[PDB]
Design a protein around this ligand. Structure first.
Ligand SMILES: [Zn+2]
Length: 336
């Protein structure tokens, strides 16, 4: 209790940014997006038009139906960055452990967490305050997001987290960089507020929080429109990374959990993972790698990928060697 449980005391970077090309990784933490409403997973609608074309051109890898560790934000987000797998993870004691962010920051990787969701759910607690930035509010309301007044709800948009991101990179031009963007995404129940008018293409839309009152299709339409906005956001995120040429880049996207959309009377999420509908545990996962990338996409295990692959992935992306993630399954193979 009075001091933290360590996992990566043996963590060593095999190569550092002073002996090789620096690495710049953006980790997008999604929200409520589920795998089967992704067009690149066989969904009848084109919910991810930009990603669909990048996948069909071989720019982005799709990891299929990935399993989340849990069915809520408060549960999953700490576990996504944990050294403990979903089966040994305890949400009530997550703060007692060092996480992969702690490790990376300790080894000298420049961490920046921008949040248009809620907060980092404890993950960022040991790091200096300035490394966590609130993007849920405009500055007047004490935030940092300059893209809020684009809609009648004055809700801050995810694309606002991409503004002035160059300044952080220029500040740490000599070292490895990890930027976590915590997305508002498909947060319900008011899906119709999650996207600007630009993406209101699936009509008509349920413009109410009473999801069980609306006809199911109108709720789905809103949900799918919010996916469109996320797809666009990921596209602009990839475009930004592609503009960074003096570094090896990577964009990793995973939703924190899926969503029930009226299946057998179940709405929203948060159902206990033991008997939760599989929709709440089914999430999309995408990887984008920059030009002349040193990294390789890992083979898919027969059981499929899960949230447990994130921490070994982030470590492999920064050449970190530790017995906390020796033989574990990652999205990206470990480099020599
Ligand atoms: Zn969530």
């Amino acid at each position: 209790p009075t001091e933290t449980i360590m996992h990566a005391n043996d963590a060593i970077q095999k190569t550092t940014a002073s002996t090789r090309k620096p690495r710049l990784v953006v980790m997008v933490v999604g929200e409520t997006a589920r795998a089967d409403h992704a067009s690149f997973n066989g969904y009848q609608r084109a919910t991810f038009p930009h990603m669909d074309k990048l996948i069909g051109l071989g720019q982005v890898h799709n990891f299929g139906n990935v399993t989340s560790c849990g069915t809520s934000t408060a549960y999953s987000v700490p576990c996504m960055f944990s050294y403990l797998g979903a089966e040994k993870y305890d949400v009530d004691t997550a703060d007692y452990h060092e996480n992969v962010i702690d490790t990376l920051d300790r080894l000298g990787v420049a961490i920046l967490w921008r949040d248009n969701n809620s907060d980092s759910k404890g993950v960022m607690n040991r790091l200096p305050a300035k490394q966590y930035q609130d993007y849920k509010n405009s500055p007047l309301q004490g935030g940092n997001n300059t893209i809020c007044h684009t809609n009648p709800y004055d809700e801050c948009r995810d694309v606002g987290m991409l503004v002035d991101l160059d300044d952080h990179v220029k500040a740490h031009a000599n070292q490895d960089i990890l930027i976590v963007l915590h997305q508002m995404g498909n947060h319900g129940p008011a899906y119709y507020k999650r996207y600007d008018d630009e993406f209101a293409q699936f009509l008509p839309v349920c413009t109410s929080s009473e999801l069980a009152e609306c006809e199911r299709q109108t709720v789905i339409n809103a949900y799918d429109n919010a996916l469109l906005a996320t797809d666009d956001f990921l596209k602009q995120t990839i475009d930004w990374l592609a503009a960074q040429t003096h570094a090896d880049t990577a964009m990793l996207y995973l939703s924190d959990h899926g969503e029930s959309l009226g299946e057998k009377g179940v709405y929203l999420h948060g159902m206990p993972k033991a008997f939760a509908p599989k929709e709440q545990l089914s999430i999309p996962a995408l990887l984008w790698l920059g030009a002349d990338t040193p990294f390789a996409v890992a083979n898919s295990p027969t059981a499929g990928f899960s949230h447990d692959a994130i921490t070994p992935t982030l470590l492999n992306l920064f050449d970190v060697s530790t017995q906390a993630t020796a033989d574990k399954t990652a999205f990206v193979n470990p480099l020599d």
